[PDB]
Design a protein around this ligand. Structure first.
Ligand SMILES: *[C@@H]1O[C@H](CO)[C@@H](O[C@@H]2O[C@H](CO)[C@@H](O[C@@H]3O[C@H](CO)[C@@H](O)[C@H](O[C@H]4O[C@H](CO)[C@@H](O)[C@H](O)[C@@H]4O)[C@@H]3O)[C@H](O)[C@H]2NC(C)=O)[C@H](O)[C@H]1NC(C)=O
Ligand SMILES: *[C@@H]1O[C@H](CO)[C@@H](O)[C@H](O)[C@H]1NC(C)=O
Ligand SMILES: *[C@@H]1O[C@H](CO)[C@@H](O)[C@H](O)[C@H]1NC(C)=O
Ligand SMILES: *[C@@H]1O[C@H](CO)[C@@H](O)[C@H](O)[C@H]1NC(C)=O
Ligand SMILES: *[C@@H]1O[C@H](CO)[C@@H](O)[C@H](O)[C@H]1NC(C)=O
Lengths: 293, 157, 189, 190
């Protein structure tokens, strides 16, 4: 029982069969001496009388659109959502967990203050997501998230397609700092046409960094069957590269790491490949870039 | 230069924290409880940044800064790093003294990081509560030494 | 401090003789409560106003030092408790001297190992107003079964009797032995 | 003759289903079922000649109250009647086959099968195996500690194809739903 937005209320209904539901008092916001009639979209006929109606919410049948009518006109409308609760644990059914049993996957390409948060829905009718910085202190770091958009990268889990939603967010500060102390915490308000679910996450912007592959991987022949593999820093990575550094991994197709932008090794007759990673933290590795032997 | 000593300090800190990660895993190191030691001589968070991201001015002297890269905020950066290291070294010596005096050998503070801090110093100027305090001090010092390595690598190379 | 959410206390002392009971009082500072037991860094046993302050009882605690931590989730605070025994009185205290005119060293029996920090005081005494005292520290790293008096003796003595005593001190009580007596005409070897 | 052995049950946490087996020739049959309860209110769903119906939570159907189900099939100008079932749908759960690729390991005259499942209850695993020359042989697997489960099977001097399933069980040992369908076949050489 709380007001999500104007004339939109949400209730917490326990999903136990024998358990009783909640009682809701809904009042049309205009007074008239004439008795106020009530109508619903999930039910037929007049359901209420007077300006105040009591509803025993027990299931998704007792939710939806409630309208107050007088004479031959309407006065106001008020929605009503549900929030499932099961054995004390709130439901998580709109979203599908990733491979690592998490719901929200956020990734940043550099130390610029912008990132991308994505999730995996289960069905695709009437989803209205909303991502915002769930502040809990006056000094909490604040982000300005954008509108959630569909992505055409249908992922495969359980040998089954799952459709992917993505949103772009950017943290803004008065002037940037040297390190990160208070983690970014985010809240998602998912809803499926009557059903309301709340998700939450918290992370730093340093353990979610996923760099880009090297852009110009080439190859120089040298004497006695030994060659040179050279690459370059990605153009999307933060500048300068002396302060933000990387360690690259080289594998011939078990790999050895190189801190310089040039390595030498003998070939086997197949595609040699490099990937990038942050030197200090154990951040996520990049996708490989390659060059034929 | 001081960069090699800084990398040695990073390696020793990583080794000792990875040992503490199983030796004191049950106390508080398994949540993270990010709290640091100083909030008011913590100028490193505002000055130790490259001179290409300093958009606004709102954000000892040292003897290891090269003269090919001389600036105004860099001396404050190195002085604040020195003062933060002074506080960290004082607290680490105190906690080591309080840790050897009891009959529990389930933790060791190797002197490699202590002497690494000491040479970084000399180059830069010419019960149960103690172990969890050590865990939180390490959880702050890891990010501190990463920041120090970043700024000194930018300053030297 | 570091145990900011609350505190844990034990009675009557963190050091307890073997095979006794223990009481743990876990209190929570304003703005449930269970206990977790760790023996040799291994989780062994899992033990309104109920969430504000509570007490827990422990019977037949494990041998050696162990850990009790109070749990809400977040660890509010914890405590370590060492259990042992008072030192048994020593036995068979012999003293020998190495050299023509040098220093005597003395050996004894420590009995059962105390399992905790303990020290032993060696006291040499003798007439014509001569005495000497020092310590030796027994713990998990260093053991004390031999000691050196560090004092040179004189060869002109052939008539008196000297006294050697040893006392055992720890936090669980004191212990002494017989004030043994020896003669200074055959120590030299 | 006529529809028989109706079974409405719950395929997934947010989804529900119903099935029935029809006897007789199929020439112009149209299958619709009626869902009745007391809000009477007898809604009906249409699926044509198919013999399965899928719905979910927000289709305006009661899943926490007592619900009556029955089926009317079509034949020209005549109807065929079915039995009535009265049940709840939330706690009559049909579980899933084993999740994804399972791990098979061979020991002396034995095969051990392991997997990861998203149900904490002990499902009575009943498996079946078949060497590719003859028909199938059935067998119960046995109780296990429950996350992850294990199954055992005797070997064979030739290769074989083996399938495995689960069903939900209460704490009383009572059958908590219908039998889940078999997983993908597992092939093992000798
Ligand atoms: C995440 O989702 C959860 C739901 O699982 C959600 O928790 C709910 O939050 C709302 C508001 O934040 C809570 O509603 C409040 O409950 C308290 C205690 O009952 C009331 O006192 C509040 O009264 C408000 O409204 C009155 C009338 O408008 C005002 O007069 C009064 O001053 C208050 O403003 C209000 O009803 C609700 O109880 C919880 N649900 C729980 C605890 O189960 C949560 O907000 C979502 N978001 C985040 C970031 O967690
Ligand atoms: C623990 O407290 C109870 C009552 O609070 C008391 O009876 C008992 O003796 C105490 N235990 C010890 C070892 O003193
Ligand atoms: C030993 O300890 C007891 C404890 O009260 C004390 O009374 C006694 O005097 C002590 N004896 C010696 C020799 O220290
Ligand atoms: C499901 O819930 C109903 C409600 O009373 C109960 O009668 C029944 O025993 C439960 N279990 C099954 C398997 O139907
Ligand atoms: C099940 O999950 C665990 C996670 O710890 C994993 O180690 C294992 O390989 C998985 N598969 C099995 C047990 O078949």
């Amino acid at each position: 029982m709380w007001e999500l937005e104007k004339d939109v209320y949400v209730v917490e209904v326990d999903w136990t069969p024998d358990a009783p539901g909640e009682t809701v008092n809904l009042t049309c916001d205009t007074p008239e001496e004439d008795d106020i009639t009530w109508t619903s979209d999930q039910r037929h006929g007049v359901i209420g009388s007077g300006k105040t109606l009591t509803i025993t919410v027990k299931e998704f049948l007792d939710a939806g659109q409630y309208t107050c009518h007088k004479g031959g006109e309407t006065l106001s409308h008020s929605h009503l959502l549900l929030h499932k609760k099961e054995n004390g644990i709130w439901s998580t059914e709109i979203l599908k967990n990733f491979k690592n049993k998490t719901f929200l996957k956020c990734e940043a390409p550099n130390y610029s203050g912008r990132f991308t948060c994505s999730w995996l829905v289960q069905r695709n009718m009437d989803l209205k997501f909303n991502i915002k910085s769930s502040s809990s202190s006056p000094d909490s770091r604040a982000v300005t998230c954008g509108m959630a958009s569909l992505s055409a990268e249908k992922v495969t889990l359980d040998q089954r397609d799952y459709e992917k939603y993505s949103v772009s967010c950017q943290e803004d500060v008065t002037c940037p700092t040297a390190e990160e102390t208070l983690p970014i915490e985010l809240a998602l308000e998912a809803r499926q046409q009557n059903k309301y679910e709340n998700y939450s996450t918290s992370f730093f912007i340093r353990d979610i960094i996923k760099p880009d592959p090297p852009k110009n991987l080439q190859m120089k022949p040298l004497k006695n069957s030994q060659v040179e593999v050279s690459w370059e820093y990605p153009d999307s990575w933060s500048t300068p590269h002396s302060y933000f550094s990387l360690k690259f991994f080289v594998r011939i197709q078990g790999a050895f790491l190189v801190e310089k932008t040039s390595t030498e090794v003998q070939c086997k007759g197949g595609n040699v490949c490099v990937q990038a990673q942050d030197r200090y933290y154990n951040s996520s590795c990049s996708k490989w870039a390659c060059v034929p032997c | 230069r001081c960069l090699s000593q800084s990398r040695n300090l990073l390696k020793t800190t990583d080794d000792m924290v990875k040992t503490a990660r199983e030796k004191l895993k049950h106390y508080s190191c398994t949540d993270i409880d990010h709290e640091d030691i100083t909030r008011d001589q913590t100028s490193t968070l505002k000055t130790c940044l490259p001179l290409e991201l300093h958009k606004n001015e709102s954000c000892t002297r040292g003897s290891c800064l090269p003269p090919q890269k001389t600036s105004l905020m860099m001396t404050l950066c190195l002085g604040s790093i020195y003062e933060d290291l002074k506080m960290y070294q004082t607290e680490f010596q105190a906690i080591n003294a309080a840790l050897q005096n009891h009959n529990h050998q389930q933790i060791i503070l190797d002197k490699g990081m202590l002497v690494a801090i000491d040479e970084l110093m000399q180059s830069l100027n010419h019960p149960y509560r103690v172990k969890m305090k050590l865990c939180i001090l390490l959880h702050a010092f890891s990010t501190r030494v990463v920041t120090i390595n970043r700024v000194m690598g930018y300053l030297s190379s | 401090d570091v145990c900011k959410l609350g505190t844990v206390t034990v009675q009557p002392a963190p050091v307890i003789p073997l095979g006794s009971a223990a009481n743990i009082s876990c209190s929570l500072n304003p703005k449930e409560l269970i206990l977790l037991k760790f023996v040799n860094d291994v989780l062994v046993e899992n033990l309104d106003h109920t969430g504000h302050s509570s007490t827990f009882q422990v019977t037949n605690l494990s041998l050696g030092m162990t850990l009790f931590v109070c749990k809400l989730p977040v660890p509010v605070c914890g405590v370590e408790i060492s259990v042992g025994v008072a030192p048994e009185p020593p036995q068979n205290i012999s003293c020998v001297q190495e050299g023509e005119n040098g220093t005597v060293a003395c050996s004894w029996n420590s009995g059962k190992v105390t399992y905790l920090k303990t020290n032993y005081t060696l006291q040499l005494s003798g007439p014509n107003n001569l005495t000497c005292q020092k310590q030796c520290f027994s713990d998990n790293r260093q053991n004390c079964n031999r000691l050196d008096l560090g004092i040179n003796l004189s060869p002109d003595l052939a008539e008196s009797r000297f006294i050697v005593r040893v006392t055992a001190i720890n936090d669980l009580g004191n212990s002494s032995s017989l004030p043994h007596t020896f003669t200074f005409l055959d120590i030299v070897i | 003759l006529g529809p028989r052995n109706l079974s409405c049950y719950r395929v997934s946490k947010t989804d529900y289903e119903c099935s029935w087996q029809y006897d007789g020739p199929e020439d112009n049959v149209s299958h619709v079922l009626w869902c009745c309860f007391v809000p009477e209110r007898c809604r009906y769903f249409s699926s044509g000649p198919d013999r399965t119906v899928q719905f979910w939570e927000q289709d305006g159907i009661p899943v926490l109250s007592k619900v009556n189900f029955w089926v009317e099939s079509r034949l020209g100008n005549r109807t065929m009647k079915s039995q009535k079932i009265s049940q709840y749908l939330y706690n009559w759960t049909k579980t899933t086959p084993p999740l994804g690729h399972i791990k098979v390991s061979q020991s002396h005259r034995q095969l051990r099968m392991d997997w990861n499942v998203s149900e904490e209850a002990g499902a009575e695993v009943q498996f079946r195996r078949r060497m590719p020359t003859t028909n199938w042989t059935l067998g119960d697997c046995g109780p296990q500690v429950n996350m992850s489960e294990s199954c055992l099977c005797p070997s064979e001097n030739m290769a074989q194809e083996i399938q495995i399933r689960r069903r939900r069980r209460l704490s009383s040992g009572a059958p908590g739903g219908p039998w889940s369908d078999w997983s993908m076949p597992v092939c093992v050489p000798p």
